[PDB]
């Protein structure tokens, strides 16, 4: 969760305009699991 906040900060300046967030993050990501 601390990474969620920190990476939100580190990737919001990439967009710096339009993108509530929900699933349309300012970064690219997919989850791999068990």
């Amino acid at each position: 969760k601390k990474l969620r906040e920190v990476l939100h900060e580190l990737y919001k300046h990439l967009d710096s305009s339009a993108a509530s967030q929900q699933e349309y993050y300012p970064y690219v990501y997919y989850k791999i699991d068990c």
Binding site: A18, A19, S20, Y24
Partner: peptide, 23 residues
């Protein structure tokens, strides 16, 4: 050719953002 869809200031700042984000 731009085609104009009209909405009555229902949620332009939100669903217009959503249109930008999905299309």
């Amino acid at each position: 050719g731009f085609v104009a869809g009209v909405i009555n200031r229902e949620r332009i700042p939100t669903f217009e953002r959503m249109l930008w984000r999905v299309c």
